[PDB]
Amino acid sequence: SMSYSWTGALVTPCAAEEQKLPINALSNSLLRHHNLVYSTTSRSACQRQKKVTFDRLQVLDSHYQDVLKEVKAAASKVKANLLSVEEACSLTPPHSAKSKYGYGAKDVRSHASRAVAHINSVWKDLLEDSVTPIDTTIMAKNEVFCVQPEKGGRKPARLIVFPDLGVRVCEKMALYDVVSKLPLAVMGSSYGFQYSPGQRVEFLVQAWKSKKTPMGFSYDTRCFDSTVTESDIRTEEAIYQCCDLDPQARVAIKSLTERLYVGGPLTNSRGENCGYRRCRASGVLTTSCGNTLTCYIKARAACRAAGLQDCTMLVYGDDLVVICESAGVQEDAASLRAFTEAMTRYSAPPGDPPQPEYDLELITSCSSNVSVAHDGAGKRVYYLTRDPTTPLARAAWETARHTPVNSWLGNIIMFAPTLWARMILMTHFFSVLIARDQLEQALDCEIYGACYSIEPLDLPPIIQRLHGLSAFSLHSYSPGEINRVAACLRKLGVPPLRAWRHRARSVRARLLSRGGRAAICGKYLFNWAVRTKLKLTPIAAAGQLALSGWFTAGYSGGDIYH
């Protein structure tokens, strides 16, 4: 069937939508080529609608069925509980889209009578009705990028589809424990979200070394969400139902599948009927879990049809990396084309055809890649990095305008060992916080989709736990990585690294003079900025922190707060 059917009504905005990066002195100090930086808006929604709309032809085979059997078998070891209303309410972010029924995120979070009354009635309705399609809102995501004329200039906005706040709370009640436990049990080491960035690196490196002659590739499915069929969404439900579940949970899961997940009507911000969805909803709790499962199932089956030898897979939502034993150059190319063919039959053809890579560093997934630096003692250290353009463009925007969720903090945490994060992002934001007297205030940032409340002053212990002490001592980065950062700076009109070094020394000093946690920031985060180096020893605070939930519970679709 058609992934979507449209009425003609436009995807409409809620409030004013700034297109171009605002001129602000502090954002300008990071990035000056403001004309290159843009936010996607509802104005480009039609362009996206065209791309995401198509017929799905799906043909399953014995390899697929074999794999699905394995998955259902593994899922049967999982025991998931219902969350209570109160528990589900606290997993709601404060910034979450308000209900159409006279309450918002703040009210959910403080268990207000009108919110709980509606949530209970929505729950009752899920148990009583299993067929009536549930209403959803369609919105155009406002995301920031840098323009690329070479690649056809401005990207069209992504479409986010979500049900009302009340339903989203009920989703947590029914499924949060399932989406938290199931993927890991089913996929084991292939489940991407379990890994901290440091662990992810170690996993990729060992997988690479475990082959006599390694070959790797990434597979990018064109419009993964549109490729997910009704039957894929029902297969997911069948898999959820393999777990040991509460009776009410089973009813609610089945209702949410048939009334919400498989499809339903799309309403714009002005209440107009936009059309109907028959594919994955971007803004539901199960999006991340479901996409990972379906991708994994299709990929694992496709590996077999492709005749790939000794396959190690890493799956994060629609992001797939496979590392395997090479059969020869021509043999590998051949098997990769057969892989693509299998995936296509499974309804998930590529955006760009996958290419074999015989060097680990060349594999790009989730827009990241492995690279090499050296630690204090000159030992080789691997770490995850990425092209800094988008992180920098967003960082500038987020300086110019207050955004409820702050991606820059996420990037500092996620890419802490990197040259660009340490020298530019850290220096910049610590100088901005100092300038605005916001150094002690907690911020909301997203990590692997989940929304977190993080104090900037806790950055050092967080980094140590996620990346190790070496993250504060890396030097002698690779020439490729330096060149990529350099090229990014030129393109965006960001000051050069040495300029940042000077600034970082000043920031460091200001931080050290405040004592306490701020001193530790100055000491550990900016040790690179001075020749006369302080001794970096393990931080006590890191030990006295529990960071486990960080690499278990994250769903981009999910509206999750920790």
Ligand X SMILES: CNC(=O)c1c(-c2ccc(F)cc2)oc2cc(N(Cc3ccc(B(O)O)c(F)c3)S(C)(=O)=O)c(C3CC3)cc12
Which residues are at the interface with ligand X (CB under 6 A)?
Answer: 192-193, 197, 200, 204, 216, 314-316, 319-321, 363, 365-370, 384, 414, 448
Question: Alpha-carbon distance 352 to 357, whole Å?
Answer: 15
Tokens standing for 199?
A: 């662990």
* Closest separation in Å from C-beta 554 to ligand X: 7
Residue nearest to ligand X (CB): 363
* Closest separation in Å from C-beta 458 to ligand X: 17
CB 55 within 8 A of CB 74: no
Q: Which is nearer to ligand X, 49 or 368 (CB)?
A: 368
CB 403 within 8 A of CB 93: no
Q: Which is nearer to ligand X, 316 or 500 (CB)?
A: 316
- 146 forms beta bridges with 37
Q: Which is nearer to ligand X, 173 or 488 (CB)?
A: 488
* Closest separation in Å from C-beta 292 to ligand X: 10
Q: Which is nearer to ligand X, 82 or 363 (CB)?
A: 363
Tokens standing for 497?
A: 């690294």
> Which residue, among 159, 138, 170, 173, has the nearest Cα to 264 in the 3D structure?
138
* Closest separation in Å from C-beta 361 to ligand X: 8
Residue 542, CA distances (Å) to 196, 349, 396, 465, 537 in order: 15, 44, 30, 6, 11
Question: Residue 537, class by beta-carbon neighbours within 10 Å (0-12 exposed, 13-18 middle, 19+ buried)?
Answer: exposed
Q: Which is nearer to ligand X, 237 or 319 (CB)?
A: 319
Question: Alpha-carbon distance 172 to 208, whole Å?
Answer: 37
Question: Alpha-carbon distance 450 to 558, whole Å?
Answer: 8
> Which residue, among 307, 326, 342, has the nearest Cα to 219 in the 3D structure?
342
CB 274 within 8 A of CB 264: no
Q: Which is nearer to ligand X, 253 or 313 (CB)?
A: 313
* Closest separation in Å from C-beta 295 to ligand X: 9
Q: Measured between alpha carbons, how far apart are the two ends of the chain, in Å?
A: 38
Question: Residue 79, class by beta-carbon neighbours within 10 Å (0-12 exposed, 13-18 middle, 19+ buried)?
Answer: exposed
Residue whose token pair is 């089945």 = 254
> Which residue, among 371, 433, 440, has the nearest Cα to 402 in the 3D structure?
433
Residue 18, CA distances (Å) to 15, 118, 493 in order: 10, 34, 21
* Closest separation in Å from C-beta 404 to ligand X: 18
Backbone angles phi, psi at 129, to 5 degrees: -120, 120
Q: Which is nearer to ligand X, 191 or 346 (CB)?
A: 191
User: Where are the strands (E) in 346-449, listed by range?
Assistant: 350-352, 368-374, 380-386, 443-447
Residue whose token pair is 């996958």 = 354
CB neighbours of 217 closer than 8 A, spacing ≥ 6? 321, 322, 336, 354, 355, 356, 357, 363
Q: Which is nearer to ligand X, 175 or 320 (CB)?
A: 320
Backbone angles phi, psi at 216, to 5 degrees: -135, 155
* Closest separation in Å from C-beta 379 to ligand X: 21
Q: Which is nearer to ligand X, 169 or 421 (CB)?
A: 421
Q: Which is nearer to ligand X, 107 or 444 (CB)?
A: 444
Residue whose token pair is 């589900």 = 88
**276 three-class SS:** strand
Backbone angles phi, psi at 53, to 5 degrees: -100, 115
Tell me which amino acid residue 271 is: G
Q: Which is nearer to ligand X, 123 or 477 (CB)?
A: 477
Q: Which is nearer to ligand X, 97 or 384 (CB)?
A: 384
